[PDB]
Each structure stands twice: as C-alpha cells, then as structure tokens.
Design a protein around this ligand. Sequence first.
Ligand code: W0F
Ligand code: MG
Ligand code: ZN
Ligand code: ZN
Ligand code: ZN
Ligand code: ZN
Ligand code: ZN
Ligand code: ZN
Lengths: 257, 67, 87, 98, 82, 115, 45, 49, 576, 93, 8, 44, 479
Amino acid sequence: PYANQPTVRITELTDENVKFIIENTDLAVANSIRRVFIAEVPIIAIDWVQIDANSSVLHDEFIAHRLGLIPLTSDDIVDKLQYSRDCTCEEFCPECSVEFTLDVRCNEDQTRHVTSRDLISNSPRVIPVTSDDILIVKLRKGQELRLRAYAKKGFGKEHAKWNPTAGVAFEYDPDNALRHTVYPKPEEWPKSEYSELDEDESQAPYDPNGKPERFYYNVESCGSLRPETIVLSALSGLKKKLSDLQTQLSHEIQSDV
Amino acid sequence: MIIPVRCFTCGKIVGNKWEAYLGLLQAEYTEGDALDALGLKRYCCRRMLLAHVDLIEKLLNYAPLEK
Amino acid sequence: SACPLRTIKRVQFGVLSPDELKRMSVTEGGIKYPETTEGGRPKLGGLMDPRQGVIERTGRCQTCAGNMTECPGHFGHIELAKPVFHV
Amino acid sequence: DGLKYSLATGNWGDQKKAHQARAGVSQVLNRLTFASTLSHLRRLNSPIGRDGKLAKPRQLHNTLWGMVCPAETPEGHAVGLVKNLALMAYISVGSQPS
Amino acid sequence: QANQKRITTPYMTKYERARVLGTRALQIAMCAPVMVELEGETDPLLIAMKELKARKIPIIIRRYLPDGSYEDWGVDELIISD
Amino acid sequence: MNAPPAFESFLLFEGEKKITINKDTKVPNACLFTINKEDHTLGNIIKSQLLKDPQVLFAGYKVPHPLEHKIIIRVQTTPDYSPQEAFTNAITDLISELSLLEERFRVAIKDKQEG
Amino acid sequence: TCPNHPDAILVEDYRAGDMICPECGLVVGDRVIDVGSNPLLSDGD
Amino acid sequence: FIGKIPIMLRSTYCLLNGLTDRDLCELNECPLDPGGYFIINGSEKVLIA
Amino acid sequence: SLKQRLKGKEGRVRGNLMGKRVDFSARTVITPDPNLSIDQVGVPRSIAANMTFAEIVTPFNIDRLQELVRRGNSQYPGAKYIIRDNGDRIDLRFHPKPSDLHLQTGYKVERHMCDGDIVIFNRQPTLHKMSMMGHRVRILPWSTFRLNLSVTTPYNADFDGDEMNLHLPQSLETRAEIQELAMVPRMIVTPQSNRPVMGIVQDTLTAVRKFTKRDVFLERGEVMNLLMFLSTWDGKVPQPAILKPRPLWTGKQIFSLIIPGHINCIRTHSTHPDDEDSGPYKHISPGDTKVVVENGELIMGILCKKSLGTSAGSLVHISYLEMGHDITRLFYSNIQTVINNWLLIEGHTIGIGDSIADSKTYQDIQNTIKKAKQDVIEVIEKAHNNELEPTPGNTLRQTFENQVNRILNDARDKTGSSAQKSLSEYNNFKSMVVSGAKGSKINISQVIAVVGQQNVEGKRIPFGFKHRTLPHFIKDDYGPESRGFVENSYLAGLTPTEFFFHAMGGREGLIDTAVKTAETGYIQRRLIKSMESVMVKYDATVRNSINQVVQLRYGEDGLAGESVEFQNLATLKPSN
Amino acid sequence: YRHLALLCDTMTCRGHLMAITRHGVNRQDTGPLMKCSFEETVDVLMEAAAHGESDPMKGVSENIMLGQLAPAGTGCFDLLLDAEKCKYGMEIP
Amino acid sequence: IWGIGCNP
Amino acid sequence: MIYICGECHTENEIKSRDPIRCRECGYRIMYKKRTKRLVVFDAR
Amino acid sequence: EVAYCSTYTHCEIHPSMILGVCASIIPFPDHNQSPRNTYQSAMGKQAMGVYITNFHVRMDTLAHVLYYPQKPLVTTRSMEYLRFRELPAGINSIVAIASYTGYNQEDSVIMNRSAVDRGFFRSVFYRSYKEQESKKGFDQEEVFEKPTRETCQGMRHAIYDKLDDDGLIAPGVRVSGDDVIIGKTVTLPENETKRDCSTFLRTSETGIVDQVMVTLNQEGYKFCKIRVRSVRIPQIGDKFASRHGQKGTCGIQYRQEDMPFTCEGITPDIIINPHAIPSRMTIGHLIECLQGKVSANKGEIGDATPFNDAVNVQKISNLLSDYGYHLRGNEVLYNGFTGRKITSQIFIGPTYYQRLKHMVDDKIHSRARGPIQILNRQPMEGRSRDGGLRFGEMERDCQIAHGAAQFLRERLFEASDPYQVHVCNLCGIMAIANTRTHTYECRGCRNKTQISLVRMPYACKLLFQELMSMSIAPRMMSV
RNA sequence: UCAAG
Ligand SMILES: CO[C@@H]1[C@H](O)[C@H](n2cnc3c(=O)nc(N)[nH]c32)O[C@H]1COP(=O)(O)OP(=O)(O)OP(=O)(O)O
Ligand SMILES: [Mg+2]
Ligand SMILES: [Zn+2]
Ligand SMILES: [Zn+2]
Ligand SMILES: [Zn+2]
Ligand SMILES: [Zn+2]
Ligand SMILES: [Zn+2]
Ligand SMILES: [Zn+2]
C-alpha cells in the first residue's frame, strides 16, 4: 500500500529538448506529469498592454494578442515573482510584474519590421528569448507603433500564452504487448522509434500480467524555460498541489470530528 | 495577414521563421527542404509556414492614413 | 372597476342598425371636415376627434380619461348624403 | 433619376408605374468573402416564380453542361431558380447581322 | 346531480391532477393553511404534492357531463392516477 | 458575452471549500469526497494510488460536468480502515513518489551534463 | 408624478419603457413607451 | 447636357480602367477587386442576369 | 382595407389572435451536452438573468427572497422587481429606498430564473406533440441552449446551427400543468404509434453495440470508473464474470446494472441468422444475438437499434410500460453516461481504410459490371432487330427500359453485396450500420462498389440534347453509361459525365425536399382545423363542440394509444 | 387505428362526405368564429352577421380568441373549495 | 442516385 | 476636436458648426483623431 | 481504340471547367455526394476571410475579417484563377474524426481551446453606423451636438459621457451596449425645446470604435460614419464547416492537456463525429485529410482537381507510407484525461476548415416584459426591437394536444396582450367607462346600471371594433 | 431582397 519508487534516464538533453524515460511508475502519475508540463508550469508572459499610438495595418487587439504570444525568458525570476493576485500592491509593481516598452516609427522608405528585439524590458532577466526575431508587425513609412506592456506570472491553465512546452511526446508500451490498442492489421503500422522488436514481428506477444510501465517522454521548450527546468518545476508544482490538498483535507477531517 | 506566432496545434514559435523560409525559397531550396532546415518537423508546424498567405505586404501597399 | 367581471358565454352577430350607429357614435353631426387638424392639432367634427380617441400618448380623450390605455376608442358616424351598397 | 432609381430600388421600370416593374434585379453586392463577391457577379436568375412549386424549371437540364454550374444553386425555396455561370462560360455581347 | 348515480370514472384524470395540484399550490403560496405537516418543505408545489398523497387537499372537482349535469367528486373520493 | 473568466477554473471563489467530505449512506465504510476547482490531473493520481491500497475496496473519480470545475471521488475501505485515512495515505504516497522522482531527475540532469 | 414624491423628475427607461422615480424606484406608468409611434411640400392633402 | 449615366466600375468608361495595380492602390482601390458593379447612392449594386 | 387586414395570414384573426408574439421567451443556438439529464436543459446566464419568475412572499420563503432582493439585478441570483400588495412595482435596478427593500407576506419578488425552474422548449416547425416538452433548467456558463442527445429525436434537431425557443411559465398553476403533463420523461412513448419517441442515438448506440459484445472484458479500475457514472448504483460491485486468473468483468455484466429494476424482454440483433432459431444452438447463440433480459439482467445478446431504439417492444419501451417514467428517465441518462465514458477507452473513427476493399472484391465488382454491360448490349441488339416482344400493358420502349433497368439494378445490388461481404469486423462503416446509429447498407455499397443508376422523374437520364444525353455521347445511345449508370464508387471517383448525371439526381432529391415541406404543412394545418375541438367527454363519448357524438367510445374501445401494445391472439391461426 | 378511425368518423359523421377543405369544414354548423379562424374569415363573419347567428362559445378556438379558458383538458371541469375539509386537519399556518 | 425503385 | 484629413493627413482643428474642409488640401473627408484616454488590452 | 466515334469535331479543354466559382474550391468534388457539393457551394459564400485588401479604407456594415487566413493544403488547379490563394477564407486544421466525449455528436465539433488561445479562427467584426445632419425641415434642424439632460427636455438615461463636443465618440473608446455612438438634437418648434435624437449602439456589441469620419453626403448635409470593431474569439456556439458540406457548431472546447494526443504530441484542433461521414457519403473529406497529411510532410500543396486519373487513394496512401505514418492515415491516439491508448486508432489529418458568419452572440435573444406594438399592443418583433418569439398556430395546436389549457391561456392572452373592456349587459356592444369618474354609461340604451367588465386580448378588442366599422355587430353577451 | 432551419 505504498508508492512505487520511480527511476529516470535522460537519453537526450539539448537546449530545446529533453528525452527521458520514467520507469516503475503508474500510468496515472506519468500522464498527470505530462499534463502538468502543459498546464501548470508557471511562466512570465505579457498580459497587460496599453497602446498609445498604432498606425499599423493590424488593429490594436491584434498587436496585443501577438505580443502576448511572444515568449519571455523566465528561467529563474518566475519562482521569485508573485502572482498579481498575491501581491499586496494595487495593479502592478516590480515584485509582481515586469514592464516592457515598445516605441518604433518608420521614417525610412524601406518597410520597417517591428521585431521582438524592439521590446525593451526594465528587468534584465526577462527578455523576449533574444540573446531571427519574432515579427510583431510590419510598418510602412509614416506609420508608428508605441505601446507599454506589463508581464505577469501564470500557467497554461489560464491561457496558452503561459504554456512552457511546444510538444510533449508521451508513449508507453512501444511494441503493443498489453494490447491497449488493437490493430486491425498489425503489419501495416509503422514501428515505434523506441520499439525493440525485430523487423519480422509487428507486435510483441500479449502479456496478461504486464501493466503499463517504462513511460517514454520527449519535452520540447519554447525557450521560456530550460527544458530540464520545465520537468523539475512540473514535478515540484504537482507536489505542491498534493500538499495543499492534504492541508485542506486535514482541516476538513478535524472539523467534522 | 501576418505570420502567426506560436503554431496553433503545438505552440512552437514559428513567427520568427517566415523571412528565413522566404529566403531559403529564394535560394532554390524546395519547400520541404526549407521546412526541414528551419527545424519544423511535425506536420502541424509545417502547415503554418507552408499554408501562410502574407497579406500584410498588400496592405502596406496602401498609403498610410496619417503621415 | 366596480362592474363585475364576466366571461362571454355567447357572441351574437348582427348587422348594425343605422339608428344604433347614430346613437352610439360619440361624434355628433358626423365628420364635417376632411382635414384632421384644427386649432393646430385637434379638429372637432374631423377625422382626428379628441372625443373619438386618445392622441399623442399623453392626452386624454374627451369621453373618458383613457390615458392611451384605459380608453378602448369610440366610434364615429358619417351620414352619407345618398345610400351606398355595402360590398 | 430614372437610371439611379431603377438601380437603387431594384424595380425595373418607372417610379410612377410599378405594375410592369420586375423586382430582384440590382441587388447589393455580397462582400462576406471574395468568393461571395465573385459568385454574386456571375449569377443567373430564372424568372419563374418562387411561389409556384412546379418542379420542371428547377431540375438540372442536360443542356446546362459547361454553361451553368451543376452544384451551385441555393437550397430552399429557390432551388434551381438561381444559377451561377461556369468558369469558362461567356455570354455573347451581340453584333449586327448585316 | 345526486350523490348517488355517479357515472364518471373513479380515477382522477391527469388533467384534474395537474389543475388540482397547481391550484392548491397557488393557495399555499397565498398563505393558506396546510393540512399536511411539512418536513421542511418550502416550495408550495411540493407541499401540494404531499397533501395530494395524503388525500387532504380541500378541493372538490365538479365534472360536467355533456348533457349539462355535473357530478361533484371530492379529491379524496377520486383514486389518484399515480 | 456569457464566457466564464479563465481564472475561474483554478481559483476558489470566496466561501468555497477545496475539499468537502460527505459520507455515503448506501454502503458501509464509504465516503464521497468533493474537490472544488480541480481537474483530471489530481483526480487520476489520487484514484490510482487509492486502487493500489489493499484495504481500499472501491476508488473512482468523476467530473460531474466539464464546464463546471469539480471532482467527486468515492472511496470505500474495508472495516478497520477509514476512507479519510486512505485518502491521506494516498496523498502522502504520491508526494513521496514525486519527491523521489525529483531527486533522481536532478541526478540524471547533473550526470548528463559534463558526463 | 410619483405619488410619494411631490415634484419628482422621473427618469426614462429603455428596457421596459417606463418612467421611474430615481429615489425610490417606483414604476410610474407600466408600459407607456410602446413604440412611441412630406409636411414641407404642399399642405394637408 | 441631357443627364448622367451610372458607370459600372472598371469598365472602359470608369476612371479605374487601364490603371496599373500601384495606381489602384494609390486611389485606395484594391487591385484584386473584380469590378462589374455600380456604386449607386453609396452602395454597390450588381445587376443579376 | 378592413377586409384585407382581417383576411390574410398575419391579420388580426390569425396573425394576432390565434398566434401572437409572447413575453418571457428566449431563443439561441442549441449545442449537445451528454452530461445533462433528459429533462434538464442548459440555459445561458444572460438569458437566465433577463427572464424572471415572480414568487409570492410567504412566511416560509421570506428570508430567501429577502436575500435575493438584497443581491439585486447585478448579482446573478437576484431579483429584478418587487411587486407590492397595492400592485406598485419597485424596480430594484434604479435605487430603491432601504424601506422599499423590506418584504412582507403578499409581496411578489421577481427572482431571476434559477436551476430547477420548469420551462417549455420548442423547435419550429412544431409538427407533433413531442415538439414542445417541459424541461428543467440548469444554468451553465456559455451562451447556447444545451439539451441531451436522446431528446434530439423528438425535436428532429441536430446541432448544425439549429435553434430552439424557451418559454418560461409565469404562474404556479401553469408551472404545475407543465410539470405534470408535458415534462420530457412523461412523453417518452408517443400515442401516435404506441412506440417510444426517444431512443439511444449516435455514439451511445454505436458504443453500446461494442460494449455488449461477448469479447468486451473490463478490468477492476475500468469497472470502478464506469460504475462512478451510474446514478442508480447500489454501491455493491458485481462479482466479476471471470474470477481467475485475473478478475475481469464483462460489458453485459455492467450494462445489467443500468437496466432498471426487473425487466423481461427478448429481442433480436440486426445480424441475427434466420436459420439459427430452427437449428441447434438456438438458445446458445453462436453469434451472441437474440438479446434476452431476465430479472433486469442481460443474460445474452448484442444491443443495437432494435433493443434500445424507438421501436415497439424495445428495452426502453418495456421500461416505460413496466417501471414507470422516472426510472426510464434515469435509464436513458445512465446508458448515455456509462457508455460514453467507456467510449473514451475504446473510441470510434471513420477513415479511408474503411472505404477501401480487398483486391479480389474490386475485381469481382468489375467483372459484375462487365457482364452487366454486355447483357444491356444484348438487349439493345435484340430491340434493334425487333426480336423483343412487348410486355403486356407496356409499349416496346417501356419494356426495353424495364429489362435494361432490371439488368442494371441486379448488377448494382450484386456489386453492393460483394462490397458488403468484403467488410471486416473492425470496419467502422459496418459498425455504424450494424448498430443502426447512422448509415445503411446502400451507403456502404455506393461508397465501396457502385454508386448506381441515376434516375430523374422515374426514368434514366433523359435526352436533353437532340437524341443524346450529353454532347459527348453518340445519338440514339441507350447503353448503360450514356443514360446515367455510375459504375465508379465514391472512393474511386466519378468520371465527368457521371458527375453531371449524379448532380442531376441530387438536384431531384433537393427539389423533392423543398416541395414536400410546403405541401405537408398545408395538409397538417387543414387536419388540425377540422378536428381541433373533438375530445373525450366525461361520458367517455368523443364529441365535438356542437356535442354531436363522433364516437361512442374513443377508438371504439375507450383506451388511450400509448398504453396499448402489439400482441398475438394465438387462437386464430391454429387448425382445429 | 384510433387516429385513422377518428379522421374517418369526422369526415363521414354528417352522412355526406365532408372534405377537409374550406367548403366541407365551413359548411358544417359550427360556431361562426371557429369558421372564421379557418380560411374564409371575413366572408363567414359577414354571412353570420346577416343571418343573426350566435356563437355558442363551446369551441376551443373561440375561447382562445376571447382570452377565456379553453374547454380543453384542464378546462373541462371547475374546481370548488371544500369548506368541511378546510375545517378539518391541522391548520399549522 | 441509386436506382429506379430506390432514391434518385 | 482635431480632425485628420484623408487626402493630405494634416490635422486641422474645426469648431462646432464649421464647414468640414481641410485647409491646405480642400478635401471633405476628415477622420477624428485617436482619443487621449487609454484602453487596457488583455493580451488574451 | 475499339471504335466508338471516329468523327469527333470538338474537344473539351478540361472537364473541371463545368463547375462554377464556389464549387471550384471543393477538393475532390467527384468523390462527394451531389447534395453535399451543393451545400458547400452555399456555405462557402458565408465563410470568413479577408474579403478585400482595401478593407481598412472601406466603411461597410457587417464586415468580418479573419485574423490568420491560410491557403488550402489540398487545392484545385482552378482555384488559382479564382484568386483564392491571394485572399483565403479559412485555416488548415488538424482534424480528428473520432468520438471523444459525446460533445461532438450530431454535427457539433470539439475544438482545442489552447489553439483558440493561440489565434485559431479568430476574427474581427466591423459595424458601421451612419447618421446625417438634416436641416431640410422648415423649423427642424438635426444639429450634431452632445445632448444635455437639463438643456434637452427629451433625453435618455444611457451613458452620454463618451460623446465629445461634436457629438461623435472619438476612435479608440470602448462602447458597451446601449451607449450613445452619435449624439444628435432636433430643435423643437415651440407650439406652446428638444426631442432627443441620438443613435444608440446595438445591444451586446461591446466593441471599440475604430474610425470616425465626417463628410458631406450627396445631399450636401453633414454625414458621419462610425465604425465599431469587435474581436470574436470562437465560442461553443459558433458554426464551422469544411469544404465538403459538413457544417456544425462547436460542442465544447478542451485545452491541449485534455485533447487526445498522438505519440508525437500533436493534438487535434478540431474533433468531428465519425457519424457525420457515412450517411452523407463525403469521402472527399477523407481523401482531403490523407492528401493534406502527405502535403504537409512533403511540403508541396496537394492537387485536388475533380477529374485527374493520376491521383488515386492508393497512390496517396503509398506516399504517406513513405513518410512514416500508417498508409490509410490512421494514428494511435492517447486519451488526454487518463493517458491510456485509445483501442481504436483515430483518423487524424490536416483539413481546410472554414468559419461561417453565423455566431451565437449575434443569434441569442431573450425577452421579458419589453416594449409593445402600437397597433396591436403586443410584443415587438425582432432581436433589434427586443421582440418576443411568436407562439404560432402550430404551437397552439401542440398545446391543445397536450391539454395544457392554462399555459395556452397564459401564452396567448396574459403574456402577450392582456386588456380589460366594459360591455353593456343589455346590448353586447362595448360601453364608455370613466374609471376615475366612476361613472359608466352606455350610449344607445341610455342605460348606466347594466355594464359588466370583460377581460379580452387587445387584439380581440381590435378585431371586434374592425368588425363594427364594417357594420357587423359582435354583441358579446355575458348571459 | 438576401440568408438561417
Ligand atoms: C430534417 O428535417 C428538417 C426539418 O424538416 C427542418 N426545415 C429545414 N428547412 C426547412 C424549410 O424550408 N421549411 C420547413 N417547414 N422546415 C424546414 O429542416 C429539415 C431538413 O433539411 P436539411 O436536409 O438541409 O438537413 P441536413 O440533412 O441537410 O443536415 P447537416 O449534415 O448539415 O447537419
Ligand atoms: Mg440541423
Ligand atoms: Zn505588486
Ligand atoms: Zn506545431
Ligand atoms: Zn375614451
Ligand atoms: Zn418616488
Ligand atoms: Zn487635408
Ligand atoms: Zn347598451
């Protein structure tokens, strides 16, 4: 009646990708970790825009949306930052937000490409993943865009702008042995990259005793967080959710009795 | 009208890759080769760059409302 | 309001008597004036008679204090010089 | 004023006389999509009344091969009574017979 | 009619049940006394349903025969259609 | 116009209890836990860990409606065991598993880099 | 003309179409907006 | 002077006839606009055949 | 003119008296919601806030209504107005004096519509009585009306832009009328055909067929999750059908818990072999057909449209006839919830792999078409030689068309049968056709084998040009391709001429739909007007308004149409 | 069969085949307002006025027009209060 | 679209 | 009360009940300038 | 060949040219059922996209422009001449044909909420309001100015703070429903000061002013056009359709975590019910998904000309087999909620989906004690006028069949047009009645005692009075 | 007049 002891092997580790294999774990835990990658890893992204002048062809809310989708480096400052709801100060302060300011005007005849590099942050740690560049808008001569934006901490359950990952690849039982998916014609299906079978055999023989284990992961990052940091923060955040549940449950249990 | 940041299906930033894609096409790369070189691997991401129509240049052809 | 509430149990249909039309109509002497406006707005003995119905959503018709809701309207009569077949 | 009135109202005739006027001509151009604009410009309207439910004018005819789109017709009370030209179809402008 | 020689159905019709429950509920909403003890029931319609189950609704149904006569069946006398 | 705000999915509004424990009258030693402002993430882990316990006879989770944000978890335990005890022990076990996984993932990171 | 408020300006309303006393909210006039409903050329014809 | 005839857009007698796409842009008219419609009383009307 | 005003539709007589625009009514797009019960409807919050139901203040409910008054219009569970004893209406939006907010018995607070408020739900056209049913209100946080999928069949509504009308009764008397006469559970069975109106539909039907197969075995946790969505569960886990080696429940075992009470029913699956009943294995059915439910437990059988659909003797019909309307409502909802949560584990799909068939089957279809074209050629040559003999009562042209159509139809059906033989068990077209959720054998045949003959006005494609169908064909060509036979399937793709002929056939279908709507509407209105006042009097005679006796007893036996059932006399047929 | 038989009985009740049309339905001696709701309208009203016809007000449509409770179901009977039963029982409020 | 006895 | 001009894009202040004509171009199609008050846009 | 015709005199340039403009955008038209091509021809006219490149200059009522139009991945050759690539209307979407949660049943569609957040099928709605300062009246002048409650005897309690001095709201100001876009005042002749003549925003527009223009119209009076912009994020009521006649609303929106995911991590943007395909027989949709997968992997836009004979399903399947996927396009999916593999393999591929103009926000209406008509004193008609829904004659027949006489009475009398009249007992004709004076008298009888109150719909009173004006006497007698 | 069922 106790938790299984999981293990991890990291097959690949790059700047934008982490491949790891979690073994001796339940399927529910592995899928929940995959889910927390997507929806519950906090990141800093723009959520407040005040546009002073917008002569571009794109309307103001278009520019606001594009700005929000721009990833911002949140490697270490996101843990320090507090949610805007938690902060005592009214609206936004340096402890609860990061201020970005953008001023661009096209006076040259050539079209001016407003890029993420033109976004200027008051805090050095949070930068728009620049150290090409994301194109916010293109400006004709005589067109000007000036705006002021504040970035808040949040996770992807609120909005996809706070989604740390690009694509989380989750796969278990690479050669179908628990028969969780029943192929009508086993031969036609392409073999998995993790499959251990020889070319002749399409599926592994059915194992009734076996249960899902040795889950394979591939986490890719947008550059907002280090791909290792996404996994570590997801594990820590899920642990925090469970601990909060335990505290509230203890309160209810004691109060009822 | 303009290349979308963050490919819809997965979320990979694809807004920085439009000008590079056009330049690779000018370099006589095939569209598939350009997509491979840019690092777009999943067909969801390749859809974004391959099927994008850049209307913002046509919109920029018009003179500005205020000079 | 003092009148008791009743539900119609029989509807009797008949041709209106000309004498009954004369008695029932609030307008007396008929509609003598084609114009609807006299004294500026109201034309007595005209098409828009204050006694016939409430006008302008704020006035009260002469016959009753309708206030544009209570008054059901009141009929008027035109005395044709020579009789005309009803179609 | 005569030309402007007939275009604006959609009634083909004079202002005083609407008895011989034909309604339904000169509709406002649809600008929901470029396809809608193009199809509105290339449109045919059969004069048969919509109220009549006789089905002969509505059915697709063999002679509409290549002249009128077989698929594009409004569905409802005007099935087959409004038609769209095919892509290559060209209506004749007219010439003298001399 | 006389109380004897009642020819209508002993069972309460569905329309009678609907109108009796609605009318009794409207009366209960207007602070009419409730025959049945309520077990924390505040909605008037539910209290009317409880009364109907207990057959304590103080309404007598007058059923008009097509010949013009009427037969007065009390709600208690009628067998509930349920 | 009737769209709910995005923060409503995870933020408890004032006066809302994260966990409410209501016993089940139908069967002995069964309790029905209602978790507010939570989704399949927490529910599936808790149900799985409960199912691993030999003394837990029944364990399941249900989202009553996807548009609303609530989890209902039914736990039935054998006599000499309490459903609330099983819930607490499940949470402790999940926390232990996650902590061990964090330590081993950090070690793997350190080994992969410069090694 | 709110009966309890001598010389009270009644605010017009568009939702139900009535004039309402702003200090007490009494509806004076129930549905008295309804719909609420060339003079230059020639004259009356 | 005997009156005024409405002009269908981009026909031979319209101002937009024989104009390069840059010139159409300078007049704030789309190069891809098909034409074939009258602007009567400020609204574009199409004569259904 | 006065006569013009009164006479026409939308005049005073009909457009303003028989029907009229009404207050307390709302309309918006409808979208699905499997989680809502049959009687529940999901109302948006704005619609719920605008619509108000006046509540009389009683000593019982004075506190609750006082809280609602305090909340006001802005907060959603609030009160828009207060109606005093004098009839004075205090709009709470504009500032009411704190004295005005105080409530006493007899005041009427107009609260916003809340969960559990009975409403009437309508979809035009209102063809039958089931098109207006009383629904309980559940407020959900989006701007579309949400109704359960089973309730779509009475309304004839699908969620492709449809809309429905919501009417809120404003009095306790009319609310009770709706509650006890027109609620959805009360109108499960129609008196028109003494069949249930509503049945399991779409994903739930397709998945109930798969769930009830002999193959389906469920492990412990899956059974836990499925039982979680069963509302009437006793809390006791059924003993697994396979105790060892590993405890494994069966789909029928779980569905038996859904079945209400103790219901006995015997039905046959769609694929039931005809010879099975006579031969051995009649009771131990080899194909797991012959659905039998004993003591409310599914002993055997694969559920399908026949067992759980809208037909006489269905499991739902027997539930309504035996258990009652409330338990049947729970039955519908529980089937949907449990089966839809199992479908997450199993899943359903449609792909090109379903349309494609084996190479041998394609060759067989091609050979059938080849020999059919040869037979049509032989008939044509016989007609040209005048060897053909006219069928009695028919001209030679008519009999030639008859014989050619017979040959083409036989080839079409044979190719369709070959395609249907090719289908595997895993084929999803076959899953949906066998379950009865959607599609037909004809659609499979057209998808895989042969689209078929295109007929317009009951004949092959006519000679629109002079003596030829299209300019591409030769004059006086009565062959199969020329006159409209589409040899290719949809998957294979139609040749251009076949595309045009197929367009002609589809146009005929569209025109028929458009015409039938109007003509049927007129017929229905005339029937209703002729028979509107006829009713069963307390003499149980059926009399009109004039009191003339139409029938001495209703239906000649004085019984209602919903309670009756099909039965066999069993004394009539046997010999002496 | 009940629904078919009822239509057949209404059409053949009078002894002459009554078509479900304006002619057959309106010729039957129903109330003038009920005839007015179906097709002919104003002409029916004019004829009824000429001959001094009286509307019995027993029809459903006639009662619907005047806003009264219809004689249909839930309107067939008239409920009366039972004083003796009101006295009996526990009058808690 | 099927045959003469079926549908168009 | 500053109107931008369509033809020459030069702001001209126009008083109430004054003809709508841009000085320096004569064009009669004016646009009102963007308001000074600022609107918060959620990037969402 | 085997001799059929040896006297051909002309040849077709290409058979696909029989189709028109709207039917030419359909990919693989020959693989669909004919009514479905007909339906797509109508649906394509209602799709959203950039209608014209000069849309910023144009001030049109009801203009919708999509944020990120994309050209089809599977396109017809004849689309190039239609300029569909230049001005596309729709977005290629990863579509899974599966039954996930039952919210895609019937024709509804499950959409990815994370994709919607990233800009998927987002649009802008521009509405233009025109007003003209008319001085044509002899003593009436409709001057543009900001109305003042004290100065103007006629006014409304909606917000007037937005209006500037000119009476026109400045661009960039948010406007909620029932706000004053334009303020206009008609000088009132003093027969013996001001009847308000402002224009008010359509309810629930909730937009930001984009452009405000002041000109002189054809008549020479001052003309003002105001364009209001409203972004429209897709909701669970909006209507989405493919190019193969499959239309449906959005059943529900699931986030990327909840949506089913492939092993690569690709989650469908749109999930459509498998039950739509078989009855409708739109196989062109399936072939378009297969060709779209092949095109996205290969990097070349797929060719879907109607009649090709060089493009077959088998060839597309082999091409897809080269790129590492199942040849028929099926993919193994994992359940988002639990992570278990779905036993059936779901058919996933990119498909061009369109967004139609019909949206739930424009189609939602609720009425409760609103304004009434003048002639009938019945509720108004239409969403703009806060009109109630009509309780038609078919509806009343249904209610009669129910036996719900009192609900029928409420709906047809009490909810719509309640009214009271006074009728003489001696003669059925209505009688004059002064409630305030408390004197009730009947003309023609010289009788005051015998008068009875009758409750009837106002429409019935109007009917009886119109009968009386035709000399018919509808004598309603209580006896 | 044009769409929505
Ligand atoms: C199924 O029947 C309905 C109803 O009868 C109602 N309805 C629709 N139009 C009318 C009309 O003009 N007049 C009247 N009286 N009723 C009307 O609509 C019918 C079907 O029409 P459709 O055949 O287009 O439905 P798809 O099969 O097309 O559904 P997809 O796959 O798009 O969701
Ligand atoms: Mg539909
Ligand atoms: Zn702060
Ligand atoms: Zn991607
Ligand atoms: Zn009066
Ligand atoms: Zn007051
Ligand atoms: Zn200028
Ligand atoms: Zn009198």
